[PDB]
Structures are given as structure tokens and as C-alpha cells.
Amino acid sequence: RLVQLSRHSIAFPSPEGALREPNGLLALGGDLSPARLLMAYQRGIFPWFSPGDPILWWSPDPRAVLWPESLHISRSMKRFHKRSPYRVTMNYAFGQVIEGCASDREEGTWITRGVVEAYHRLHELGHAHSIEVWREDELVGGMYGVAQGTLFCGESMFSRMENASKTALLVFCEEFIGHGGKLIDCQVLNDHTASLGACEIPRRDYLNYLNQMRLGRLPNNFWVPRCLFSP
Amino acid sequence: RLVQLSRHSIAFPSPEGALREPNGLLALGGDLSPARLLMAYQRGIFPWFSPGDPILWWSPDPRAVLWPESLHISRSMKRFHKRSPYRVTMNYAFGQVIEGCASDREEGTWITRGVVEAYHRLHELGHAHSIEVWREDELVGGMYGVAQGTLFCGESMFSRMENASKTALLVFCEEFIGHGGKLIDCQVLNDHTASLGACEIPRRDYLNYLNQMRLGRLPNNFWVPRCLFSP
Numbered sequence A, B: 001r002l003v004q005l006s007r008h009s010i011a012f013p014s015p016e017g018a019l020r021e022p023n024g025l026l027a028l029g030g031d032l033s034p035a036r037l038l039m040a041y042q043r044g045i046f047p048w049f050s051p052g053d054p055i056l057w058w059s060p061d062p063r064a065v066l067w068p069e070s071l072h073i074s075r076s077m078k079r080f081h082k083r084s085p086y087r088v089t090m091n092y093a094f095g096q097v098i099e100g101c102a103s104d105r106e107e108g109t110w111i112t113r114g115v116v117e118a119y120h121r122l123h124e125l126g127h128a129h130s131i132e133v134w135r136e137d138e139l140v141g142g143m144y145g146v147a148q149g150t151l152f153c154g155e156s157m158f159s160r161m162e163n164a165s166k167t168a169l170l171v172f173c174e175e176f177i178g179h180g181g182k183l184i185d186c187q188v189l190n191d192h193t194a195s196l197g198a199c200e201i202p203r204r205d206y207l208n209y210l211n212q213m214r215l216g217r218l219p220n221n222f223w224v225p226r227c228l229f230s231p
């Protein structure tokens, strides 16, 4: 059954109880406060809803996921990256990035003003991180998400220049993999997610990786704002 | 003579040369950078100064200290905690905890903007940690400090609801003891700190503990964001 959240509790219902159709719908209401969001991510839940509607929480089954090493990179893209015109930094402009994704008319709809301020908050508290792609001094691409130990929950990505988000993702994965990263959550499997090399795994499996991975960890300074790639 | 620290290098004078009145006043100037602060904690020094004043570094003698096990808990508090209405978490909102302490108009003036930023960096690098106390969807209390092996240097705590900060310390001590935490530095002795069970030990006694406990270690992932207690 669909649980109505309220200001009284920050907890969530067991995901095993999410609806079948729409795939994942678990609860609604509450708010997008930091503590509630973390509470959600740690239980394999995430918010998604359009402007005007109440907050919706999901935990779909199967779950979209991306194993860093299985990231698909075309022969063409490698040639591009070997002579990349982009620079990739970490946590330099979280705001510009999420704003870029929100700006995307075709996919940024669910990124309302309330969602933006919410994740910016998680960013300032150090749980949300952004990968930025620069061409000269102009942000032309990026991605962002929530970290859970060796698990990364991908929120969204955007691009204003050819191959910008592929670079963000290509570089992040190298970094992530090289320091102990394990999995990237793509939430739902679709044309975009599938093109990156994401695959579906049962929810029960995702939750078990979740509880396992948020306990594991990366270098003390892994999420510190820095440059990840420069030509 | 109060040594005037140099910007050029990170280096403190022996705590023994500190003044006797004001207790511990040992040095001034320098900066609030990660390496200098981390250095301060190593040697038993800590910054404390009011806005519109130069950086002041202290090493009081005697030093206030709290042995995890000697933490005092009244019968009413136990009765209260048994049916606690609070949720306690670790490293969920460091920024919000420190900001809470800094907002306490009674004893938070010393937590200047430069200090908040300074400790945000330590939290970023994984040395500074917080403990948040939630009532429903609200942050009603908490505490934060700098980890030093098995020793925890408490910096400050705040409270917006009866027994909030006691709950924070109570859950912390249990968790801390459970994984080998040995001592909690309280810096100076006050009424609240003493009521909790804190006490005074000579500076040179504290310094030996520090040098010893700094070496000891806690479980690699003791500080990962998580829930320590839920109502």
C-alpha cells in the first residue's frame, strides 16, 4: 500500500512493499529535507515527481545499475578522448551542474526548484557531488549524484557540447574504479541508461549491494574539489 | 612570551610554556588551515577567539576530560531514553550541527565564520565529525569534534529540545566505547560538562594520553554516515 508521509516521521516503509505498476511507487509526501533524503537513499529509495504534484518516492524492481568497468566506450569516443578538448573537475560548480540538468527541457522536468535547493543542500553537507566538464571557461557538461560509500547514486547528467557527458562519465569511472568504487546506480533502465552499459538486477540484489557498499569507503580526500582530467 | 606563529610554517611551541592565567593561552596568529589545525590537535593545542580578534591557541592545565564509561546518566534520563522520541545519526549534517552551536548566543560567539569554514574542511577530509539529534524532521541538537585515534576532542554541542544534547552524548559514548574509543577531550571544565561526568587531569597527563591514543585506531569505517539510534 502507498504510505502517506508527514512531518512526524523521517523513516520509510520497506521497499519490498512498493507497487508493481507504476514500477516502484512506494510513498508520497513529507519533504526534501537532508535527513529524510539520506534516510531514503540508505534504504534504496529516491524521490521523483513532476512540478505541481506531491513528492513521490520510488524503489523500482528491477533496478538500473552500471558496473564502472562495464562502462561502454566506442572506438570513436576513445579517439575523441585521446585528444579531448575538455577538462574535468570535481565538486567545483555543483550549482551550475544541477542547474544544467534541470535546464534540460527533455529530461530535467523532475528537477524542480525544490529538488535543486534540496540536493544543493546535500552537496553543502558533503553527500552530493558533481563532475564538471569545461571547454575553455564554459561549463558545457556534467553529472551529479549522491555517494554511499563505494556506491554512487547517479541523479542526472547534461550536455551542451558533443561528448561532454560521456567524458564526465568516462573520467569519473576511471577515478572511481581506481580508488575503490564499486557500483553506480542508474535507478531506471532506459535508452540513455542502457547506452552507457547499464543493466538490470533484482531489487533485493540492489538493496544487498547497498547495505554492503555504504559501509565500505574511499580515500579520505576522494570527494575533495579538484581537477580530474586536463589535456 | 606568547609566540607569534608564522604563516610560512606549521609549528607550535611546547604547551608547557603556555600562560597560567588566562589558563592555557599559548600562541596567536597563523591560519585555520587543515594542516595547521591537525597539527594543533596532535600537540594538544586548540584555537579559541572572539570575532574581531586574532587567532588564539590554547592548551589549558589542568585539562577537562570525560572517560566514556564514567558518563553520568540520571534515572529520569534513562527513563526518558528508554522511550526516547529522538533519532540520533552520525555525520548526516555536520554543517548544520556546527551552525547550531555557532548560533547559540550564549556560548557560540567563538565559532566565527572562519572557524566554521575551517572545520568544514576537516570534515571534508574526514577528521571532523558530527552527531545529530532529530525530533521528527527537525534538528534539535547534536555535537561535533575532531577524531584523534581512540581519542575524541569535543569542540561543542547545542540543544533545542529537552535532553537533546544528552541523548547525543549518551548514544555516542555507547557506540564509541563499543569500538574502542578511549577518551573524550572536553578542553575546559564547566557546569554542564561536569554534570555529565567530565573531570580534570593534569596537562602533561593529558598529553601522554593524546600521544598514546593518537596512535591507537578505530574501525576503518567507524565514521560513515548512518543512524545510531531510532525511536
Ligand SMILES: Nc1ncnc2c1ncn2[C@H]1C[C@H](OC(=O)[C@@H](N)Cc2ccccc2)[C@@H](CO)O1
Residues within 6 Å of the ligand: A048, A107, A143, A144, A145, A153, A154, A155, A156, A157, A169, A184, A185, A186, A187, A188, A190, A192, A193
Ligand atoms: N524514471 C526516472 N527516475 C529518475 N531519474 C530519471 C528517470 N528517467 C530519467 N531520469 C534522469 C536520470 C538520467 O540520467 C541517468 O542516466 C541517471 N539515471 C543515472 C546516472 C546519473 C549520473 C551519472 C551516471 C548515471 C537522466 C537522463 O539523462 O534523467
Ligand SMILES: Nc1ncnc2c1ncn2[C@H]1C[C@H](OC(=O)[C@@H](N)Cc2ccccc2)[C@@H](CO)O1
Residues within 6 Å of the ligand: B048, B107, B143, B144, B145, B153, B154, B155, B156, B157, B169, B185, B186, B187, B188, B190, B192, B193
Ligand atoms: N574555554 C573554552 N574552550 C573551548 N570551548 C569552550 C570553552 N568554553 C566554552 N566552550 C564551548 C565548548 C563546550 O562544550 C564542551 O564541553 C566541549 N569543550 C567538549 C565537548 C564538545 C562536544 C561534545 C562533547 C564534549 C560548550 C558548552 O556547551 O562551549
